[PDB]
Amino acid sequence: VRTIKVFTTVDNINLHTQVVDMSMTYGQQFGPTYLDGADVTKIKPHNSHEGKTFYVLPNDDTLRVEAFEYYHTTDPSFLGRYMSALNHTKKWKYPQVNGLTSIKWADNNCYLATALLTLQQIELKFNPPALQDAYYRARAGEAANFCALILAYCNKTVGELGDVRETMSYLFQHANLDSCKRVLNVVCKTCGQQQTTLKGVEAVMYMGTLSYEQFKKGVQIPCTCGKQATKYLVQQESPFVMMSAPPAQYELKHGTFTCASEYTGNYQCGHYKHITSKETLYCIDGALLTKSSEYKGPITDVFYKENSYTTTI
Ligand SMILES: *[C@H](CC(=O)OCC)C(=O)NNC(=O)CCc1ccccc1C(=O)N[C@H](C)c1cccc(-c2ccsc2)c1
Ligand SMILES: [Cl-]
Ligand SMILES: [Zn+2]
């Protein structure tokens, strides 16, 4: 019987040589099989498949350990969702706008492009080797495998609308933000004063205000005794801070922030645009670049740089 030899893997770095029967589909010999994202499960082997690398699912205990060491996940449907997203993201265009790698618009990838542009402006270190390698190639322009991993880690599908803030929280869980720490103090005239301390992902993000300076001076917050308490940032140890709020009209000044996310649309249905501060105020809409001196628009997320801050109160 005429046969061929292909390579099966779960991480593309540990290849396993397998012989294939050209009269049996890949689904009968290895189960769900993928070739560069293309589902070749119900396809009989071709002569052109000689020596190529095929993605398979972790069926034995050896591949389950190989998969976790690379992706840091035990989800059996991860590679299926990752290969499915890779089939679309490999056909996307990743131009270099303002020295950053963005995505030309396709299949409603506005939140993915806005997220990819933000990660290239913050100091973040991923723990899964899959994200580390893909991010290293995403900066050079090869962001197809990286964007597919983002959809897989977020349980999102190509064409599904997503939130930039929710995409960050999903990716920050796979980052090394353990050294980050935040100290907060909420003061109330009635019940009193109490200091809280946050660490990790919670010490980086905040929902309520877009101004980092107003976070230091204090922001009004409700209380159990029915009084508007004031919460101010006491101490912050992190390479960056993420300030989030519902999309409202906000003014961006030069040098006071790193990058911002613009959201125009209703809840669960809108358009995302990325705004960065460099030589002036730039606005990136996928492959579209727009320079401006000052900006004013519907802002939902603002990102700042930080080392170590301690308030003086
Ligand atoms: C891209 C779309 C596109 O390509 O457009 C073509 C011109 C895309 O994916 N855009 N995103 C989108 O539509 C948002 C969907 C979404 C999904 C899950 C959770 C939230 C959202 C969302 O709507 N987020 C925005 C920022 C938002 C608006 C109003 C209120 C809130 C809010 C959050 C907490 S309290 C209030 C958020
Ligand atoms: Cl990394
Ligand atoms: Zn109180």
UniProtKB/Swiss-Prot annotation:
Changing residue 267 to G/T: Reduced inhibition by GRL-0617. It comes from the Viruses. Inhibited in vitro by GRL-0617. A zinc finger (C4-type) spans 188-225. Changing residue 110 to S: Complete loss of PL-pro activity. The active site is at residues 110, 271, 285. LRR repeats lie at residues 116-138. Residues 1-56 form the Ubiquitin-like domain. Changing residue 110 to A: Unable to remove host IFIH1 (MDA5) ISGylation. This is Papain-like protease nsp3. The gene is rep. The chain holds residues 1565 to 1877 of 7096 of the full protein.
